[PDB]
């Protein structure tokens, strides 16, 4: 037993590139919270997990508040629900297992996915002509949003 | 500053690019610090009493009007004055250097008027 309770450097390995791994993110979704994993591998990568590593399960599933681990799924959309929070956690594990080596990982990501571009409307209505006027606002305070089509 | 416009005599349901043209000066040599300088565009009724940012049923536009210029060269700018149910408007600018209050340093007097039938 090393008995190193303190007084050292602890951990000495790096998550470098040029290796088959997993990457979970979120983009391009219309007002209903989701996620999107990505698998940049080759030659029959195996199944993977997607746990719900929360304290009280605010990042809920639809009917039963499940984790629903995938199987040979690279990109999907975990259409969750929202039981009253603005922060989460997600322990994600993936048995890679390329060739004669049971390759695994466990990344405990912390994605929080409240909306940003909070948009309100107003119409005006004249005789046989019609106009909307759209209000555009950022749901967070003093973190800015650039915007380049509408 | 000059103000280059398409027409002064537009009907109601029509879209107009407005084009201000600004000329930074030799006597910008006092500062050089904020190369970016924030203007505004304010719309007056050609009686008194300018319309608010929420120009409801009067004039319509694309984006916030603040629309920065350089202290470098002849920058241009634009809006899209989608007119609605009006007559005899007025456009003029001011220069604000910053975003805060009491940042405003000059008020130009170039007042191009247009009519709406």
> In the 8-state DSSP scheme, what is residue A48?
B
Q: How far apart are CA A125 and CA A44, in angstroms?
A: 59
CA distance A61 to A59: 7
Q: What is the Cα–Cα distance from A111 to A99, expressed in whole angstroms?
A: 32
Start-to-end CA distance of chain B, whole Å, equals 28
| A42 vs A36: CA distance, rounded Å | 19
Query: Beta strands B9-10 and B112-116: pairing type?
Result: parallel
Chain A residues with CB under 8 Å of a chain B CB are 122, 124, 126, 129, 131, 133
A129 and B13 in contact by Cβ < 8 A? yes
Q: Does B47 touch chain A (CB under 8 A)?
A: no
Neighbours of A59 (CB within 10 A): 23
> What's the rounded Cα separation, in Å, for the pair A70 and A38?
12
Chain A CB within 8 Å of residue B64 CB = no
CA–CA gap between residue A133 and residue B56 (Å, rounded):
9
Using DSSP, state whether B26 is helix, strand or coil: helix
> What kind of experiment solved this structure?
cryo-EM
Does the CB of B84 have a partner CB in chain A at under 8 Å?
yes
Q: What is the dihedral of CA A104, A110, A114, A115, to 10 degrees?
A: -60
Length of chain B: 117
In three-state secondary structure terms, A36 is strand
Residue A68's contacts (CB-CB under 8 Å, 6 or more residues apart) are A50, A61, A78
How far is Cα B24 from Cα B102, in angstroms, rounded to an integer? 21
Coil, strand or helix: which one is B27? helix
């Amino acid at each position: 037993c090393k008995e190193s309770t303190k007084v050292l450097v602890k951990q000495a390995h790096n998550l470098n590139l040029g290796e088959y791994a997993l990457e979970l993110k979120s983009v391009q979704s219309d007002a209903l919270e989701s996620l999107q994993v990505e698998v940049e591998v080759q030659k029959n990568i195996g199944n993977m997990k997607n746990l719900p590593v929360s304290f009280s399960m605010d990042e809920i599933q639809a009917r039963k508040r499940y984790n629903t681990p995938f199987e040979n799924v690279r990109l999907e959309y975990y259409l969750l629900d929202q039981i009253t929070a603005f922060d989460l956690i997600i322990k994600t594990s993936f048995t890679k297992k390329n060739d004669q080596g049971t390759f695994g990982e466990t990344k405990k990501v912390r994605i929080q996915c409240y909306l940003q571009l909070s948009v309100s409307v107003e119409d005006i209505f004249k005789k046989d002509i019609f106009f909307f006027k759209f209000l555009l606002n950022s749901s967070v305070r003093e973190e800015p949003v650039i915007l380049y089509s509408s | 500053v000059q103000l280059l416009l398409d027409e002064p005599k537009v009907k109601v349901g029509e879209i107009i690019n407005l084009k201000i043209i600004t000329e930074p000066t030799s006597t910008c040599r006092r500062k050089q610090n904020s190369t970016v300088n924030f203007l505004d565009i304010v719309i007056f009724d050609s009686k008194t009493s300018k319309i608010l940012p929420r120009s409801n049923r009067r004039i319509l536009y694309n984006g916030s009007l603040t629309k920065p210029i350089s202290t470098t060269k002849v920058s241009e700018i634009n809006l899209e004055i989608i007119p609605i149910e009006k007559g005899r408007y007025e456009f003029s600018v001011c220069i604000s250097k910053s975003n805060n209050q009491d940042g405003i340093i000059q008020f130009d007097s170039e007042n191009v008027i247009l009519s709406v039938i």
